[PDB]
CSV table of N, CA, C and O in Angstrom, one decimal:
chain,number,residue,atom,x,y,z
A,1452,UNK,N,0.9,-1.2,0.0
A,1452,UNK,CA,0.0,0.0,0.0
A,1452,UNK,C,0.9,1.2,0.0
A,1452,UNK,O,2.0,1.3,0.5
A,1453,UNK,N,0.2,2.4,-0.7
A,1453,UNK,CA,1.2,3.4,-0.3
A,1453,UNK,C,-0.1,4.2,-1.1
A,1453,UNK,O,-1.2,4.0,-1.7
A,1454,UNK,N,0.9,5.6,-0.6
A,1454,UNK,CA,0.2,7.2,-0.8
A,1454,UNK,C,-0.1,7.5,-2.2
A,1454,UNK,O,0.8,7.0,-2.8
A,1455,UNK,N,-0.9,8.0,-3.0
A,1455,UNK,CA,-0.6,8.9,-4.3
A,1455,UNK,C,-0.6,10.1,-4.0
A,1455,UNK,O,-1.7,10.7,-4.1
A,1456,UNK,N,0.7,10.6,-3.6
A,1456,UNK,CA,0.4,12.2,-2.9
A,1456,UNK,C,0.4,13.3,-4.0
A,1456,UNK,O,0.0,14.4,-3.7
A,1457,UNK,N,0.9,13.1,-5.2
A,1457,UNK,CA,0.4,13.8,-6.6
A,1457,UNK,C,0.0,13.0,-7.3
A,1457,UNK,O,0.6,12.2,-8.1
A,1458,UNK,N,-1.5,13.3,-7.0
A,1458,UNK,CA,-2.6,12.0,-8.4
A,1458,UNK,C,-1.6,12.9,-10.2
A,1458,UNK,O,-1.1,13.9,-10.6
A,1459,UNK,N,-1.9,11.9,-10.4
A,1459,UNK,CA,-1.5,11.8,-12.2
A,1459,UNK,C,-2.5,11.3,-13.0
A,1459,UNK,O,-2.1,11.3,-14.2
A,1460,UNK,N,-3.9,10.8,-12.8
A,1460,UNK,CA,-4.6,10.4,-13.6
A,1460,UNK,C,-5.9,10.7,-12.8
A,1460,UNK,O,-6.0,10.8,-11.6
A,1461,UNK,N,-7.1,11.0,-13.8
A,1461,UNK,CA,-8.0,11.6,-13.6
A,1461,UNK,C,-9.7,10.8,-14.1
A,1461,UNK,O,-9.8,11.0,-15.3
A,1462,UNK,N,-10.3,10.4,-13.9
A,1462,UNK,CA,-11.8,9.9,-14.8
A,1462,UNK,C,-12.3,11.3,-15.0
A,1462,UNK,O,-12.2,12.3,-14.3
A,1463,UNK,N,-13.0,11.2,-16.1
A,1463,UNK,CA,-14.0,11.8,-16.8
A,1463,UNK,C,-15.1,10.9,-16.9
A,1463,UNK,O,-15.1,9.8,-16.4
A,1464,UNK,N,-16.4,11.7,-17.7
A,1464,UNK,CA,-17.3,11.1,-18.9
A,1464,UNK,C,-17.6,12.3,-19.6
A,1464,UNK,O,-17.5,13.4,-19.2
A,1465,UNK,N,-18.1,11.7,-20.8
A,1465,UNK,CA,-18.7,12.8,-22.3
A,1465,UNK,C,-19.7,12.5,-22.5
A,1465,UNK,O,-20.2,11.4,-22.2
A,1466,UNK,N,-20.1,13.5,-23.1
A,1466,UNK,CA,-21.2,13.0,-24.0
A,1466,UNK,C,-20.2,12.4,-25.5
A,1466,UNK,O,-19.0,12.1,-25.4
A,1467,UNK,N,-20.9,12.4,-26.8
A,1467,UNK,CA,-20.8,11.8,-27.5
A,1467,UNK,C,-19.8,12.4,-28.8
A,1467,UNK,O,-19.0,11.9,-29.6
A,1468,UNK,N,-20.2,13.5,-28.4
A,1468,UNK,CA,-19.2,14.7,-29.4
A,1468,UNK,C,-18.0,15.1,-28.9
A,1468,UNK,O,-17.1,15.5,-29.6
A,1469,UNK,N,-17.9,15.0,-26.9
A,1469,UNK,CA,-16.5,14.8,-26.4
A,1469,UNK,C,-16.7,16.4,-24.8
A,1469,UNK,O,-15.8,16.9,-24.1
A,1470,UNK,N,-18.0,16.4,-24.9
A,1470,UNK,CA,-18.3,17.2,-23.6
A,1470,UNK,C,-17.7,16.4,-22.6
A,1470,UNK,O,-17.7,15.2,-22.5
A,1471,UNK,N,-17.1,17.5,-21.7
A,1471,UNK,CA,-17.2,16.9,-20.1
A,1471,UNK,C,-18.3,16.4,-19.8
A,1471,UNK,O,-19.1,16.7,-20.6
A,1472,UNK,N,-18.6,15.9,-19.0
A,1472,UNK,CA,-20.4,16.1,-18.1
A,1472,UNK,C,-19.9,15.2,-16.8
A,1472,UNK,O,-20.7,14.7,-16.0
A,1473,UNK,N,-18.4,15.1,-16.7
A,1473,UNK,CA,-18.6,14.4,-15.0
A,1473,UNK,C,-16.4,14.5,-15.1
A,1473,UNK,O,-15.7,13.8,-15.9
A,1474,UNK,N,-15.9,15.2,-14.2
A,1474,UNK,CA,-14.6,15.2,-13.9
A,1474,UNK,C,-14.4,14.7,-12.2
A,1474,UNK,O,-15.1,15.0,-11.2
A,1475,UNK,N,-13.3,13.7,-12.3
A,1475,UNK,CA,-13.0,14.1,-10.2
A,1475,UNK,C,-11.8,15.2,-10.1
A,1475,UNK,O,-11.1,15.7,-11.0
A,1476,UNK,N,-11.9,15.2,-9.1
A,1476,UNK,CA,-11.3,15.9,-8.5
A,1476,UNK,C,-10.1,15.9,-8.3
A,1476,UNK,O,-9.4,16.6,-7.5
A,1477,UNK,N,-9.5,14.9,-9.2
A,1477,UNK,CA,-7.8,14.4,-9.2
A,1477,UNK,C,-7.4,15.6,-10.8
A,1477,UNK,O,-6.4,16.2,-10.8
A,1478,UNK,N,-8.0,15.7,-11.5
A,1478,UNK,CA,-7.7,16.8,-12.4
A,1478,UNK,C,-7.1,17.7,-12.1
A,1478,UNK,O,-6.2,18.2,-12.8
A,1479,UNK,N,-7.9,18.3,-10.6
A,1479,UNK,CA,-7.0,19.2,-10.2
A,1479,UNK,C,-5.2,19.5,-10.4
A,1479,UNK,O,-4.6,20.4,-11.0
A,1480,UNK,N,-4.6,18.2,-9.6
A,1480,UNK,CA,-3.5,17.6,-9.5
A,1480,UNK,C,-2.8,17.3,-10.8
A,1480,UNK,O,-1.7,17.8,-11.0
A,1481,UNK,N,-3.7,16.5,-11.7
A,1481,UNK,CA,-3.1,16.1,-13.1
A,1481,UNK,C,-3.3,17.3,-14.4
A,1481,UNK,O,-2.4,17.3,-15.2
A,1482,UNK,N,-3.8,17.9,-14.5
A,1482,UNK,CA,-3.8,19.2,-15.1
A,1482,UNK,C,-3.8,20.6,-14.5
A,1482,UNK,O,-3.1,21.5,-15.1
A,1483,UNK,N,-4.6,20.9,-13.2
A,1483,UNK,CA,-4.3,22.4,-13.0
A,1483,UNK,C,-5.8,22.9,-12.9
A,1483,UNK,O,-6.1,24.0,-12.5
A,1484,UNK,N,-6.7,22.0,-13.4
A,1484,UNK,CA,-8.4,23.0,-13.2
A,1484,UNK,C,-9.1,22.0,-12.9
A,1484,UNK,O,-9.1,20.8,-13.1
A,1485,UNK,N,-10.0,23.0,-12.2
A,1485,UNK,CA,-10.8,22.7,-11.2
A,1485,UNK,C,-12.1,21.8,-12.0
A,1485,UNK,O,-12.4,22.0,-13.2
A,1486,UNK,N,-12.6,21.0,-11.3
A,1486,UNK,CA,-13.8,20.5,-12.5
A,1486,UNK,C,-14.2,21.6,-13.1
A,1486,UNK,O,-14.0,21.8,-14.3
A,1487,UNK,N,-14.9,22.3,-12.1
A,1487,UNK,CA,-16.0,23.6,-12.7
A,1487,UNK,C,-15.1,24.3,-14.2
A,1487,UNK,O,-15.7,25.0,-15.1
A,1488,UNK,N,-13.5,24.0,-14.3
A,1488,UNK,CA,-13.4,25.2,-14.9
A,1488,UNK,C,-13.3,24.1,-16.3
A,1488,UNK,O,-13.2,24.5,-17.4
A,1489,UNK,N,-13.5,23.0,-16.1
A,1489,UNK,CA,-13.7,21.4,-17.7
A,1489,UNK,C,-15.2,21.2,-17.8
A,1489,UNK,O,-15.5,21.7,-18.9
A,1490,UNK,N,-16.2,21.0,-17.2
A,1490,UNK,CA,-17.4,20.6,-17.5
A,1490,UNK,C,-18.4,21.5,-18.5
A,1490,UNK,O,-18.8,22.6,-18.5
A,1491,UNK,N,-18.6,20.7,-19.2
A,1491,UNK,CA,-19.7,22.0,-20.5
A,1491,UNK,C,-18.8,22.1,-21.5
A,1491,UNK,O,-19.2,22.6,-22.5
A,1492,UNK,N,-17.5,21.6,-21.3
A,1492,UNK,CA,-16.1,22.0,-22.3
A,1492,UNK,C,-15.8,20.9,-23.5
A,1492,UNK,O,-16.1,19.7,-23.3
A,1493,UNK,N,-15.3,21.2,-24.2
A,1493,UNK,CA,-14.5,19.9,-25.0
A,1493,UNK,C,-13.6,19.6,-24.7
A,1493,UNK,O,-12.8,20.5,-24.4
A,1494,UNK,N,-13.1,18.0,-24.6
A,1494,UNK,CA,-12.0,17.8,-24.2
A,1494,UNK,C,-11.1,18.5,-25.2
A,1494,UNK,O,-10.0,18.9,-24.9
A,1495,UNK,N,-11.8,18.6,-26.7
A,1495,UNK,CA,-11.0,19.1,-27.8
A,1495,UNK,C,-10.3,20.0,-27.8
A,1495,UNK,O,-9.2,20.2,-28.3
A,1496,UNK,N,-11.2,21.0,-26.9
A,1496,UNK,CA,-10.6,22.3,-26.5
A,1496,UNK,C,-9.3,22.9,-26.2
A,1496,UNK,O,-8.7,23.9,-26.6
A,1497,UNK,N,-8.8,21.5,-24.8
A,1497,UNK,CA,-7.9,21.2,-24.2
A,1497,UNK,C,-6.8,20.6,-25.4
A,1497,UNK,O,-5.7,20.8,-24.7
A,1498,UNK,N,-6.4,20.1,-26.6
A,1498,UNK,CA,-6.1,19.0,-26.7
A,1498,UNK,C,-4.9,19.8,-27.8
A,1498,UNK,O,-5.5,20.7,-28.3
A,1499,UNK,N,-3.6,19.8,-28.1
A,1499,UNK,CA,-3.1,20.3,-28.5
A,1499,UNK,C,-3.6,20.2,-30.2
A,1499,UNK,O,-4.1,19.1,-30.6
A,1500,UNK,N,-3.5,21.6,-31.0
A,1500,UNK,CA,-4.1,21.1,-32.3
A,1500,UNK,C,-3.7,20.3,-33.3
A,1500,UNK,O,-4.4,20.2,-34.3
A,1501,UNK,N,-2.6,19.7,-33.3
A,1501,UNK,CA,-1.9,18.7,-34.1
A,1501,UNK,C,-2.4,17.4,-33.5
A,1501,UNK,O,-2.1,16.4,-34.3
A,1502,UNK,N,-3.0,17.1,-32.4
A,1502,UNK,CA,-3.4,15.8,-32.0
A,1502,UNK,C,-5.2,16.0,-31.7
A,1502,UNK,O,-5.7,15.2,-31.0
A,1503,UNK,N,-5.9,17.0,-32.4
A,1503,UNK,CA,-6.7,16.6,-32.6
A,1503,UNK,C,-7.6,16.2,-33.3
A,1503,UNK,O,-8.8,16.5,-33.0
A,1504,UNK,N,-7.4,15.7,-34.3
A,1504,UNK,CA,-7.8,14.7,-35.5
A,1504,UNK,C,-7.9,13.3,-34.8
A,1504,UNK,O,-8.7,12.4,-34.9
A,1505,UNK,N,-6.5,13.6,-33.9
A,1505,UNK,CA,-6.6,12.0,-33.1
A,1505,UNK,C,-7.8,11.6,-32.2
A,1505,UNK,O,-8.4,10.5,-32.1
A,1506,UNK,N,-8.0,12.9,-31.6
A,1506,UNK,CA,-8.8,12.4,-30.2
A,1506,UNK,C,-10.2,12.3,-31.2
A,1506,UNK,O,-10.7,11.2,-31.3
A,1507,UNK,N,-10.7,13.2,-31.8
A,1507,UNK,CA,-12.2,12.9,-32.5
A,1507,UNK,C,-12.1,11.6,-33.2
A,1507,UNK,O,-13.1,10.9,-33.1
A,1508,UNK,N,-11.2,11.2,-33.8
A,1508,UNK,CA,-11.0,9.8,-34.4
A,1508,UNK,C,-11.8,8.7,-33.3
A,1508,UNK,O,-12.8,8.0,-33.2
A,1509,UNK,N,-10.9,9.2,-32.6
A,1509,UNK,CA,-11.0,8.6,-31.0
A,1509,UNK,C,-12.8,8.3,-30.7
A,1509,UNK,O,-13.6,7.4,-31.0
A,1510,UNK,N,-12.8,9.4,-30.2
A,1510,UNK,CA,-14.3,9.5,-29.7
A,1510,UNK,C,-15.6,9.1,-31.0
A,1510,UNK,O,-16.8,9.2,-30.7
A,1511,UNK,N,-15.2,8.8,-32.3
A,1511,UNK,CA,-15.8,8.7,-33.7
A,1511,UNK,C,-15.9,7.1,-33.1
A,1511,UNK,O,-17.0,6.6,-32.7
A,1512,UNK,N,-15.0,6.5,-33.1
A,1512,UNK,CA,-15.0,5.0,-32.7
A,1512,UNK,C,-15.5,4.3,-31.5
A,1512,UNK,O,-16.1,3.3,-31.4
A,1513,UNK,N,-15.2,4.9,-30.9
A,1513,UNK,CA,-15.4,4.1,-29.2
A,1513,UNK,C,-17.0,4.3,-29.3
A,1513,UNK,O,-17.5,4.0,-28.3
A,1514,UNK,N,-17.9,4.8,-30.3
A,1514,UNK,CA,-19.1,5.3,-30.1
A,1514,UNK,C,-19.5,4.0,-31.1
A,1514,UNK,O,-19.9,2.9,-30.7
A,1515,UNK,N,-19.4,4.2,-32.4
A,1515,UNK,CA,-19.4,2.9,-33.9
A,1515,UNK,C,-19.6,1.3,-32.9
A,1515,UNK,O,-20.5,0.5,-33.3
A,1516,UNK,N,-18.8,0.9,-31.8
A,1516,UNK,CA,-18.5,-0.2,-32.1
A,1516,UNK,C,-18.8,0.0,-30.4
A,1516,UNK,O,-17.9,0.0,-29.6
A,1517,UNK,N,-19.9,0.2,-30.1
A,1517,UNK,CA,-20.1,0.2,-28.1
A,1517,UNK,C,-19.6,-0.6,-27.7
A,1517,UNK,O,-19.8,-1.7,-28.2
A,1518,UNK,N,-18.7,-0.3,-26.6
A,1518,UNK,CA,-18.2,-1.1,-25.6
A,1518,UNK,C,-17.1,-1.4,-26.0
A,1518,UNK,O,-16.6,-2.1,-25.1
A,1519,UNK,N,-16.4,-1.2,-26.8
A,1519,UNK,CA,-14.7,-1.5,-27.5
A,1519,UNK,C,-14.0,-0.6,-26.5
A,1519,UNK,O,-14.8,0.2,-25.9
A,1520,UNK,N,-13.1,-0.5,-26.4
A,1520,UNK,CA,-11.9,0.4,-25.6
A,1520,UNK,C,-10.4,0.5,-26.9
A,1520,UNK,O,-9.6,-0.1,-27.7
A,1521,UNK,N,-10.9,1.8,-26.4
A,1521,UNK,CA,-9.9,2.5,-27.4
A,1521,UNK,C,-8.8,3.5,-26.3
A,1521,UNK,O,-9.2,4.1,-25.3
A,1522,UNK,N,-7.4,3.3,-26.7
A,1522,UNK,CA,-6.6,4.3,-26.2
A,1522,UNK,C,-5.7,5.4,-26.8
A,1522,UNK,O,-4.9,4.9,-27.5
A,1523,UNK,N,-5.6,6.8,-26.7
A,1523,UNK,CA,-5.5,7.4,-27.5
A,1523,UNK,C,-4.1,8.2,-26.9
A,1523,UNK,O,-4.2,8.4,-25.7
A,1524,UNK,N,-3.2,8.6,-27.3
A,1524,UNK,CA,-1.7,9.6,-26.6
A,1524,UNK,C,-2.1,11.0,-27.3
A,1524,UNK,O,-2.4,11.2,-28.5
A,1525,UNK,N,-2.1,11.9,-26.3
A,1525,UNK,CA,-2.0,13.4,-27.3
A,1525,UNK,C,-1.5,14.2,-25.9
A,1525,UNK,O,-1.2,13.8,-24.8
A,1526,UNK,N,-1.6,15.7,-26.6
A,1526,UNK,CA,-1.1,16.3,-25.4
A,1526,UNK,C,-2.4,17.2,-25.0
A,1526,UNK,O,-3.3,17.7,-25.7
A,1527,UNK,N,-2.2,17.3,-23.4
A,1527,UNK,CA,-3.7,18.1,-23.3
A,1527,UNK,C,-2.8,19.4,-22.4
A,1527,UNK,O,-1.7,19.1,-21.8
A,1528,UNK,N,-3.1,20.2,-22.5
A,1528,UNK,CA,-2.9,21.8,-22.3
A,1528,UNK,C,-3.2,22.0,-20.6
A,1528,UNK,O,-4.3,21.7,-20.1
A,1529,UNK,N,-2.3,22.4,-19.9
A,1529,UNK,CA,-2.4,22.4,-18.4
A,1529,UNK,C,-2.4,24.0,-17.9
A,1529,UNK,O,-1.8,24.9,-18.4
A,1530,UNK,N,-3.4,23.9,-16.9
A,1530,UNK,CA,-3.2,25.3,-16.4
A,1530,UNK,C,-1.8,26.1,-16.3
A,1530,UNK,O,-1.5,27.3,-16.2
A,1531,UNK,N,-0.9,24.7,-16.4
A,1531,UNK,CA,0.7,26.1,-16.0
A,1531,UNK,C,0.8,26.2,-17.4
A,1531,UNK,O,1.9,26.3,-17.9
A,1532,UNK,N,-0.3,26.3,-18.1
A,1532,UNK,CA,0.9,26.7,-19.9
A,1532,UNK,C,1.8,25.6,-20.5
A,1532,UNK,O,2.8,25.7,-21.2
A,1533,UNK,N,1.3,24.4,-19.9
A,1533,UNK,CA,2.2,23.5,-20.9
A,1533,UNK,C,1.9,22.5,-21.3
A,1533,UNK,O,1.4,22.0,-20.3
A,1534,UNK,N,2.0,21.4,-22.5
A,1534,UNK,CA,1.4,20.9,-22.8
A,1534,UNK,C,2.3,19.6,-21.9
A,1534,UNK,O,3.5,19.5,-21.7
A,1535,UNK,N,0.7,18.2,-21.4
A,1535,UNK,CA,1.1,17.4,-21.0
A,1535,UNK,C,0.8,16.0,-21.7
A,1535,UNK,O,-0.4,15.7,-22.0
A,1536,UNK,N,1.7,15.3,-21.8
A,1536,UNK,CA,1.1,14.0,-22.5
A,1536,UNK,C,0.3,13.2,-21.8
A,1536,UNK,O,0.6,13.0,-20.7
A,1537,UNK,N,-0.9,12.7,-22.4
A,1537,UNK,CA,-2.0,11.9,-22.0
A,1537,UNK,C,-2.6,10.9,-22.8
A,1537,UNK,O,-3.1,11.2,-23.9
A,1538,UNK,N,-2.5,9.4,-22.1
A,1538,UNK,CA,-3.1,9.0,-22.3
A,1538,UNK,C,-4.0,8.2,-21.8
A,1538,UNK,O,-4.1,7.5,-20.8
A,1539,UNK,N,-4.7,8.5,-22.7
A,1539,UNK,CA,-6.5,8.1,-22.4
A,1539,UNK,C,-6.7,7.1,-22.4
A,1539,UNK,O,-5.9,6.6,-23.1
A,1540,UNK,N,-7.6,6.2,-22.0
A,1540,UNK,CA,-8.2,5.1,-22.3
A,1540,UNK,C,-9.8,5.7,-22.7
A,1540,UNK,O,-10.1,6.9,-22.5
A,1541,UNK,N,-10.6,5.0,-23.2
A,1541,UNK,CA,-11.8,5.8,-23.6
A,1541,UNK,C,-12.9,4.3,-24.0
A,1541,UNK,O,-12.4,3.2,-24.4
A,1542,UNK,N,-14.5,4.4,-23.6
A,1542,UNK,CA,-15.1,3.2,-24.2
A,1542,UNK,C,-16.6,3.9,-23.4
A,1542,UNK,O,-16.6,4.7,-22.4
A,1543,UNK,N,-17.8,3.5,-24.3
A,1543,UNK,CA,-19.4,3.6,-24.0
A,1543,UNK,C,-19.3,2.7,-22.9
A,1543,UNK,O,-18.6,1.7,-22.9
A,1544,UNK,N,-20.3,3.2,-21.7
A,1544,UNK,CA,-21.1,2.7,-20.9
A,1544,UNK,C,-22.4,2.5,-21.2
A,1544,UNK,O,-23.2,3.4,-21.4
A,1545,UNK,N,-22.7,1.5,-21.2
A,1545,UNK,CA,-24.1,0.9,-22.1
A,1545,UNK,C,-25.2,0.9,-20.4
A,1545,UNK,O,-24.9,0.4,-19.4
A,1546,UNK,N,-26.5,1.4,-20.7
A,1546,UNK,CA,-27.5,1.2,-19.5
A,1546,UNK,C,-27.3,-0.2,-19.8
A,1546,UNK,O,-26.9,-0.7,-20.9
A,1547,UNK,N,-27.6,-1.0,-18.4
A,1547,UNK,CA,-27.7,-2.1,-18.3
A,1547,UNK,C,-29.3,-3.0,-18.8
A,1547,UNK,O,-29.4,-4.2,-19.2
A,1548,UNK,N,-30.0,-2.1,-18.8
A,1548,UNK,CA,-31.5,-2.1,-19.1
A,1548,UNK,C,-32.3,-1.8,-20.3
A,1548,UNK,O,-33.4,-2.3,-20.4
A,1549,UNK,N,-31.9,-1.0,-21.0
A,1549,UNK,CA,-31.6,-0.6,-22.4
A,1549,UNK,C,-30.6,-0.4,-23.2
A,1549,UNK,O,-30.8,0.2,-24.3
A,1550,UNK,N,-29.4,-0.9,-23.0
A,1550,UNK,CA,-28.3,-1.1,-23.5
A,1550,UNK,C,-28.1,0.4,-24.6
A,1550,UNK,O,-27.4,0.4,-25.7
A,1551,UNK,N,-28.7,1.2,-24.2
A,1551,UNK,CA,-28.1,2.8,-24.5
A,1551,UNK,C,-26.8,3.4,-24.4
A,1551,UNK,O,-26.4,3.3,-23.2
A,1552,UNK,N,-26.2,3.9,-25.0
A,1552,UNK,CA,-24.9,4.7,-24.7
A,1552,UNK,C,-25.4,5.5,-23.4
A,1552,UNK,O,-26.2,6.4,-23.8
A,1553,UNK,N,-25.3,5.6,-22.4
A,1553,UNK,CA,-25.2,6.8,-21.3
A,1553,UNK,C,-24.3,7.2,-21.5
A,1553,UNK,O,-24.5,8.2,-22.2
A,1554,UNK,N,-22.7,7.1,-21.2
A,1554,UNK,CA,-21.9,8.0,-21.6
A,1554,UNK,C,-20.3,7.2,-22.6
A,1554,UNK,O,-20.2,6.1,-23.1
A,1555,UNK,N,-19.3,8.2,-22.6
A,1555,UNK,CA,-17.8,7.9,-22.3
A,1555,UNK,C,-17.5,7.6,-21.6
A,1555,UNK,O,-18.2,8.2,-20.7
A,1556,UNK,N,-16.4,6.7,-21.0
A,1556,UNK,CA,-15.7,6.8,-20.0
A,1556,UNK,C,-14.4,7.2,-20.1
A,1556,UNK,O,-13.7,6.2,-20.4
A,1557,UNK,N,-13.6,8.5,-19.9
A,1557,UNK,CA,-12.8,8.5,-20.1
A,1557,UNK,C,-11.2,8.2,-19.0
A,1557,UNK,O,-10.8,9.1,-18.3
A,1558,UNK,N,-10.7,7.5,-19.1
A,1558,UNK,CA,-9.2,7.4,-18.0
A,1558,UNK,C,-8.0,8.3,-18.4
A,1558,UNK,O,-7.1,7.9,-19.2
A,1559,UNK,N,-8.0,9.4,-17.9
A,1559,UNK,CA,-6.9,10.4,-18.0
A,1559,UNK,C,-5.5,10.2,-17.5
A,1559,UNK,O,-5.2,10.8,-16.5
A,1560,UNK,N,-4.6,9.5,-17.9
A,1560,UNK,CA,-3.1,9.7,-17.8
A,1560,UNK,C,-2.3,10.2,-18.2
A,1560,UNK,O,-2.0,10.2,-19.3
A,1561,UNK,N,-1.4,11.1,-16.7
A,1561,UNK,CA,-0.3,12.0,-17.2
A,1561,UNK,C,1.0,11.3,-17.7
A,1561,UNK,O,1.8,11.6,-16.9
A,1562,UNK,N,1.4,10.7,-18.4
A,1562,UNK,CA,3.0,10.6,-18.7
A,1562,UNK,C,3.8,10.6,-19.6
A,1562,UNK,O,5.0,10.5,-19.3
């Protein structure tokens, strides 16, 4: 057992075009903002613009083929001004009851 006394990875969910709609509170740590200042946002927003063709690829797929897991490397943009490498893991959460997309899930890694 031990401490993670600076988290490095963060969960999300999206909607389907790549909205926030759910950050924790380890973002803080791993990028520099606050939920409040990601939610309503694109992750695209964040996402350096040479890598993102990648992440929409990204989020184009993990939607096509529910339930697949896709992982994606790009750099996402940190409150101190610099870009950090991330990667993501990404995949639909299907209701158990209607087997609807509810959301993304996304796994944010700094390294």
């Amino acid at each position: 057992m031990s401490n993670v006394s600076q988290p490095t990875e963060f969960i999300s969910r999206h909607n389907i075009e790549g909205i926030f709609t759910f950050v924790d509170h380890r973002c803080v740590a791993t990028v520099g903002y606050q939920p409040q200042e990601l939610l309503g946002k694109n992750i695209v927003e964040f996402c350096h613009p040479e890598d993102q063709q990648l992440l929409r690829d990204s989020f184009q797929q993990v939607v096509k083929l529910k339930g697949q897991v896709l992982s994606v490397m790009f750099r996402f943009r940190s409150k101190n001004q610099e870009w950090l490498w991330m990667r993501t893991s990404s995949f639909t959460f299907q209701n158990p009851y209607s087997d609807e997309i509810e959301y993304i899930i996304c796994t944010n890694t700094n390294v």
